[PDB]
Amino acid sequence: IETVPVKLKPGMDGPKVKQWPLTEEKIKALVEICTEMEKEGKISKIGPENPYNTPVFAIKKKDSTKWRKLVDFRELNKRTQDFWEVQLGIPHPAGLKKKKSVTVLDVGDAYFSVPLDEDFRKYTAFTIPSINNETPGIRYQYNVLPQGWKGSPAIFQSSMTKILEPFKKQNPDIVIYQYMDDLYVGSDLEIGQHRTKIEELRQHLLRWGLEPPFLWMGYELHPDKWTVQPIVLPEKDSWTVNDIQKLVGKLNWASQIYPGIKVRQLSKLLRGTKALTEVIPLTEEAELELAENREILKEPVHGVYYDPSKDLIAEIQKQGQGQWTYQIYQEPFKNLKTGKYARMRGAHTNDVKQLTEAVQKITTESIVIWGKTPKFKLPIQKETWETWWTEYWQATWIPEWEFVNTPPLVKLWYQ
Amino acid sequence: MVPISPIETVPVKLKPGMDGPKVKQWPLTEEKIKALVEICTEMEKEGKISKIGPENPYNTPVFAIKKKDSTKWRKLVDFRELNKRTQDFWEVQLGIPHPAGLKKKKSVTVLDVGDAYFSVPLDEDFRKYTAFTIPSINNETPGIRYQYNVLPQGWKGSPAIFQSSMTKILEPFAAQNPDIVIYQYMDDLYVGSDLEIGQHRTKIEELRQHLLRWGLTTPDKKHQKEPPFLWMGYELHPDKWTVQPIVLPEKDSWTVNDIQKLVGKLNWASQIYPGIKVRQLSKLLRGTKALTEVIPLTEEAELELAENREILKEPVHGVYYDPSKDLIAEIQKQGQGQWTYQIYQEPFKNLKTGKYARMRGAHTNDVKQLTEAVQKITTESIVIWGKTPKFKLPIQKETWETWWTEYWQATWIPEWEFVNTPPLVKLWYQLEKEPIVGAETFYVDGAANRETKLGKAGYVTNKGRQKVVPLTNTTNQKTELQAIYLALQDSGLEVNIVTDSQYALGIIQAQPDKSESELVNQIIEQLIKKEKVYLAWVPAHKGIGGNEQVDKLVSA
Numbered sequence: 019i020e021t022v023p024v025k026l027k028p029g030m031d032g033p034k035v036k037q038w039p040l041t042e043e044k045i046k047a048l049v050e051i052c053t054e055m056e057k058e059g060k061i062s063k064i065g066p067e068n069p070y071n072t073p074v075f076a077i078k079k080k081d082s083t084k085w086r087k088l089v090d091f092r093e094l095n096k097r098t099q100d101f102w103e104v105q106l107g108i109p110h111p112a113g114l115k116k117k118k119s120v121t122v123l124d125v126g127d128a129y130f131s132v133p134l135d136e137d138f139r140k141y142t143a144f145t146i147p148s149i150n151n152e153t154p155g156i157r158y159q160y161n162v163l164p165q166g167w168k169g170s171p172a173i174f175q176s177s178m179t180k181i182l183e184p185f186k187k188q189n190p191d192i193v194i195y196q197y198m199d200d201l202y203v204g205s206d207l208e209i210g211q212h213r214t215k216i217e218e219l220r221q222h223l224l225r226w227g228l229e230p231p232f233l234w235m236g237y238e239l240h241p242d243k244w245t246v247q248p249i250v251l252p253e254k255d256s257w258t259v260n261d262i263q264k265l266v267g268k269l270n271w272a273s274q275i276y277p278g279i280k281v282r283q284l285s286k287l288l289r290g291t292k293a294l295t296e297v298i299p300l301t302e303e304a305e306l307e308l309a310e311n312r313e314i315l316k317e318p319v320h321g322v323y324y325d326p327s328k329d330l331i332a333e334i335q336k337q338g339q340g341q342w343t344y345q346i347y348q349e350p351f352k353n354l355k356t357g358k359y360a361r362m363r364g365a366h367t368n369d370v371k372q373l374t375e376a377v378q379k380i381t382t383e384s385i386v387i388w389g390k391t392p393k394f395k396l397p398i399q400k401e402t403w404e405t406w407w408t409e410y411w412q413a414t415w416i417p418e419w420e421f422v423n424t425p426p427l428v429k430l431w432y433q
Numbered sequence: 434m435v436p437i438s439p440i441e442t443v444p445v446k447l448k449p450g451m452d453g454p455k456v457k458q459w460p461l462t463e464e465k466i467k468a469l470v471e472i473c474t475e476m477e478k479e480g481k482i483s484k485i486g487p488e489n490p491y492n493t494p495v496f497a498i499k500k501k502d503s504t505k506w507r508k509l510v511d512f513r514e515l516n517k518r519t520q521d522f523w524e525v526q527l528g529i530p531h532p533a534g535l536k537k538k539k540s541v542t543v544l545d546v547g548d549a550y551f552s553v554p555l556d557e558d559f560r561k562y563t564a565f566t567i568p569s570i571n572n573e574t575p576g577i578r579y580q581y582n583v584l585p586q587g588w589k590g591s592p593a594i595f596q597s598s599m600t601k602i603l604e605p606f607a608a609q610n611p612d613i614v615i616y617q618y619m620d621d622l623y624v625g626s627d628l629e630i631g632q633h634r635t636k637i638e639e640l641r642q643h644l645l646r647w648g649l650t651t652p653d654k655k656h657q658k659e660p661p662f663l664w665m666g667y668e669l670h671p672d673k674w675t676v677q678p679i680v681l682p683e684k685d686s687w688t689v690n691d692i693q694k695l696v697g698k699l700n701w702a703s704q705i706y707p708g709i710k711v712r713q714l715s716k717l718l719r720g721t722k723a724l725t726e727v728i729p730l731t732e733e734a735e736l737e738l739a740e741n742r743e744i745l746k747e748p749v750h751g752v753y754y755d756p757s758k759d760l761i762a763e764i765q766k767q768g769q770g771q772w773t774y775q776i777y778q779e780p781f782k783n784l785k786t787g788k789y790a791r792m793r794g795a796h797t798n799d800v801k802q803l804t805e806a807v808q809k810i811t812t813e814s815i816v817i818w819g820k821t822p823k824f825k826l827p828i829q830k831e832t833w834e835t836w837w838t839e840y841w842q843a844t845w846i847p848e849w850e851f852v853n854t855p856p857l858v859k860l861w862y863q864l865e866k867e868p869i870v871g872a873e874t875f876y877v878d879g880a881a882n883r884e885t886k887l888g889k890a891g892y893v894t895n896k897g898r899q900k901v902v903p904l905t906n907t908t909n910q911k912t913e914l915q916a917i918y919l920a921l922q923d924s925g926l927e928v929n930i931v932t933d934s935q936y937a938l939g940i941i942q943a944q945p946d947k948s949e950s951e952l953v954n955q956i957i958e959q960l961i962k963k964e965k966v967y968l969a970w971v972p973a974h975k976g977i978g979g980n981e982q983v984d985k986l987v988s989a
C-alpha cells in the first residue's frame with residue numbers, strides 16, 4: 019500500500035533497449051492484454067518525455083488462446099540496485115533438488131497487487147509496435163510491480179511469506195522456493211498426493227486474491243530423475259587403429275580434467291603406419307593403462323566447488339538425431355553438472371526449436387540447484403537464434419547467451 | 434466563444450546536473466533589428482512568445498536570415514546550446530513505413546495542420562530556458578527580452594512533443610473510424626479510405642470538426658497535394674508505388690565521391706528493381722576515405738554498371754499488400770556472395786525486391802549464405818507485414834536435409850519449396866562418418882621454423898607411399914594445410930587422412946566451399962573430385978606412429 023524506495027545503480031541510466039519486430043498475432047495479443055491492464059490500473063500510457071524502453075513479446079500454450087505477456091527486463095535487472103536491506107539474499111534451499119517432485123507455478127500475477135515506487139516507474143517503459151510502423155507505437159509504463167523484474171519478488175517477499183503461513187507449519191517437509199515469477203514446490207509425496215497439495219497451495223493464493231490467468235498451471239519436475247554424464251571408455255574385443263586413435267584423443271582431453279590419466283602405453287600402439295581399419299591387438303602394458311584409466315574416471319573431479327560470486331556457464335553440443343549434450347561450470351574443466359537430452363518433443367525437423375527447449379530445461383535445472391541462471395554458449399549463428407527463439411519460448415525468465423562460431427572438437431568426447 | 438479543450442503540456446527537463454544556456458547575443462545590423470522587432474511583435478500578438486524582464490539569466494542567440502529573392506526578413510533562433518542540455522525524448526519517427534506494407538486505397542486526401550504546431554504549448558517551467566534578446570539600436574537601451582510559450586522551431590523537443598500531441602488528438606478519431614487510415618507528416622495529415630466518394634468526404638469533414646474541438650483550424654481551400662505523392666524518396670500512387678527517378682550519370686572518370694553516390698542510388702533502387710548488384714562498385718571503396726581521389730573502374734565494375742543500366746532502363750512499380758493472401762519470397766544466387774530476392778503474393782507483380790551481401794569472412798559456403806539471406810528477409814518481412822513469407826529457394830529438399838542434419842550448428846529455415854532455377858545451391862563435398870575399408874591411409878604433418886619461416890609438409894601411408902616437400906616463407910598453420918593438400922593430390926578416389934592439426938580440422942569441419950586462403954581453396958578443389966574422404970584427428974606429439982614418423986620427417 020506504501021511504496022518501497024528503489025533506485026538504479028550509481029552512474030547507471032535507465033534502459034534504452036530497442037523493441038524487436040513482432041508478428042501480427044503477438045501485436046494483437048499485446049494490444050488486448052495492455053488495454054485490460056490499463057483498465058485495471060496496472061499500467062499507464064506515457065509521454066515522449068520518457069526516453070526509456072524495454073522490449074516486450076508474448077508466449078502462449080498451443081491449446082490456450084490465452085497469451086502471457088513477457089517483458090524482457092534483462093537490461094533493467096542489470097541496472098537495478100541489489101537489495102540487501104532486509105536480507106543479504108535467499109539462502110538457496112539445497113534440499114529442493116532432492117525432492118521426488120517439484121511443481122513450478124507462475125505466481126507473478128500476485129505481484130500486481132503492490133504499487134511501484136513513483137520515481138522508478140519510468141524505467142519500466144515499453145512499446146507495443148504497429149505492423150510496418152504505420153501508427154505510432156503505444157507507450158506504457160508500470161504502476162505496480164511488473165512480472166519479470168528482479169525487484170518484484172524482493173519487494174513482495176514480505177507479503178509472500180505471510181501468505182504461505184498456513185501452508186508453513188501444516189506441511190513442514192515441503193520446501194518452497196521463489197525465483198522471479200516462479201514458485202517451486204518440492205515434496206516426496208505420491209504424485210496424486212503431491213498434486214492435491216499443489217492445489218492446496220493455489221487456494222491460499224486465490225484466497226489472498228480476494229483473477230490470476232495462469233496460476234492453475236503446473237509444470238512438474240522430478241529432480242530425482244535428473245541424470246549425469248561420467249566419462250566412459252568403450253569396452254571392445256578388437257580395436258582398430260581408428261578406435262585406438264579416438265580412445266587416445268578422448269583420454270588426452272580427459273587428462274585435462276583428471277590428473278592421473280596416462281596414454282603412453284596406448285600411444286605406443288599407434289607406432290606404425292597401418293591402415294585405419296586394421297585391428298591391432300592390445301599389449302598388456304596398454305591393457306593395464308586402459309584399466310587404470312577406467313578406474314580414474316570412476317571418481318569425482320578433484321577440487322570442484324560452487325562459488326556463488328561467479329557466473330555459471332552452460333555449453334551445449336548438437337549430437338544429432340535429436341540428442342543434445344551440455345555442461346555447466348564456472349571454471350574450465352571443473353564441471354558442476356553434465357547431462358544429455360533426447361526427448362525434444364514436437365521438433366524432429368527443427369534444430370532451433372530443440373535447442374530452445376534445451377536452453378529452457380538447463381536453465382530450470384540451474385535455478386533448482388543453485389538458484390540462478392547460467393550464461394549460455396550456443397552452437398548457432400546469432401541471426402538464426404535471434405530470429406526464432408521467441409517462437410518456442412515457454413518460460414517467464416530469460417537467461418543470457420553468447421554464440422559459438424567455431425566447431426568444438428570436444429563434441430566428439432561427449433558423444 | 435466556443436470552449437476548446439487545452440492541449441496538455443509535456444513536462445520537460447534539462448539533463449542531470451546541467452543548467453540552461455547563457456550564450457552571447459552577437460550585435461546585429463540596424464537593418465536586422467527593426468525586422469526582428471516587427472517579426473516578434475506579430476508572434477507576440479499571436480501568443481507564440483512573451484516579453485520577459487531582466488531577472489531571467491538565460492540566453493540563446495537570435496539571427497536574421499532572409500529568403501533569397503524577397504525583402505521580408507525571417508528570424509532564426511539558434512538553439513544548439515539549449516539542445517545540448519535538453520533531456521532525451523522518445524523518438525517515434527525512427528521507423529518509417531515501407532510502401533510495400535501499405536494497403537491500396539481508393540482515395541487519399543491531405544489536410545493542412547500548420548495551425549497546430551504553434552498552438553502546442555511549451556511546459557511552463559521550461560520556458561525560461563528559451564530566452565532570447567533582440568539587440569537594441571546602437572546598444573543604447575536594454576535589448577528586448579522574450580521567451581517562448583510554444584514549441585520553438587529548431588528546439589530538440591519540438592518534433593517528439595508535437596507528434597505525441599497530434600497522436601493524442603487523432604487517436605480517438607481513428608479508433609472510432611476504423612474504415613480510414615491516418616498518417617501525419619510535419620504539417621500535413623493524410624487520410625486514406627476505400628469508401629465511396631460519399632462517406633469519404635464526410636469522414637474528412639468529421640475530422641475537421643474533431644480538430645476544431647482543440648481550436649485547430651484547417652484551410653477550406655482544399656490541398657495542393659493529390660496522388661501521386663513524393664515522400665521519403667518514393668512515389669506513392671493509389672494502387673502502386675515506386676522509388677523516385679533513379680538516373681545513373683554518364684561520366685568518363687569516377688571520383689571517390691561520385692562512386693559513393695552511384696552505390697547509394699543503386700541501393701535505393703534495389704528495393705523495387707530486381708537484380709541490382711553493387712559488390713564490384715562498392716569494393717572500389719575499400720579502406721580509402723580520400724573524398725575526391727579518382728579511381729579507375731575495373732573491368733568488373735564496368736560490367737556491373739552496364740548490368741545495372743539495363744535494369745534501370747524502364748520504370749518498375751510495386752503493388753501494395755493484400756492481407757488476405759500469403760506472401761512469397763524468392764531468392765537467387767548472383768555470385769561473389771551476392772543474393773537477390775523478390776517478395777510477391779500474385780505472379781509477376783512484386784511488392785518489393787532486395788539484395789543480401791555475404792559478410793566479411795575467412796571461409797564460407799553457399800548454404801550458410803542462403804540461410805542468412807533467409808533470416809534477413811524473414812526479419813524484414815516481420816517488420817513490414819507482421820508475418821513470415823513462404824520461401825522459394827534454389828536448393829533441393831535433399832540437399833537441405835543432408836546439410837542441416839549433419840551440420841555441427843543448430844540451423845533452421847521456415848516453410849519453403851524448391852524452385853528449379855539455376856544456379857542451384859548444392860553440397861560440393863561431404864566427409865565420411867567412418868573410416869574407409871580398402872582406402873589408403875595418409876598420415877600427414879607439417880611444421881615450420883618460427884624464426885626462419887622455413888618448413889616442411891608431407892605424408893606417409895600404409896602402402897609405404899611417402900612425400901616431404903620443403904617450403905619457404907610459411908608457418909605451422911600453412912604447413913599443416915599443405916600436408917593435407919599433398920595427401921589429397923596424391924591419393925586415389927577414396928582416402929583416409931590422419932592429421933594432428935586442430936586448426937585444419939576447425940576449418941574443414943566448417944564445411945567451406947570458398948575461402949580467402951588460396952590453400953584452403955586448393956584443398957576444396959581436391960575434395961570435390963574425390964568419391965570418399967575420411968578425415969581423422971589425433972593429438973600431436975603423443976607417440977602416434979605414422980604421425981610421429983612424418984612429424985620426425987617434416988620437423989627436421
Ligand SMILES: Cc1cc(/C=C/C#N)cc(C)c1Nc1ccnc(Nc2ccc(C#N)cc2)n1
Nearest residue numbers: 535536538614616623625660662664669670671
Ligand atoms: C504511411 C502513409 C503515408 C501517406 C502519404 C505520405 C506522403 N506524402 C499516406 C498514408 C495514408 C499513409 N498511411 C497508410 C496506411 C496504410 N495504408 C496506406 N496506403 C496508401 C497510402 C498512399 C497512397 C497514395 N497515393 C495509397 C495507399 N497508407
Ligand SMILES: Nc1ccncc1Br
Nearest residue numbers: 078079086124232412
Ligand atoms: N510459462 C507460461 C507459458 C505459456 N503460457 C503461460 C505461461 Br505462465
Ligand SMILES: Nc1ccncc1Br
Nearest residue numbers: 122123124235236237
Ligand atoms: N506452463 C508453464 C510452463 C513452464 N514453466 C512453468 C509453467 Br506454469
Ligand SMILES: Nc1ccncc1Br
Nearest residue numbers: 153600603604607615
Ligand atoms: N494515434 C493514431 C492512432 C491510429 N491511427 C493513427 C494515429 Br496518428
Ligand SMILES: Nc1ccncc1Br
Nearest residue numbers: 794795797947948949
Ligand atoms: N571472403 C572472401 C573474399 C573473396 N573471395 C572469397 C571469400 Br570466402
Ligand SMILES: [Mg+2]
Nearest residue numbers: 878879933973
Ligand atoms: Mg605437428
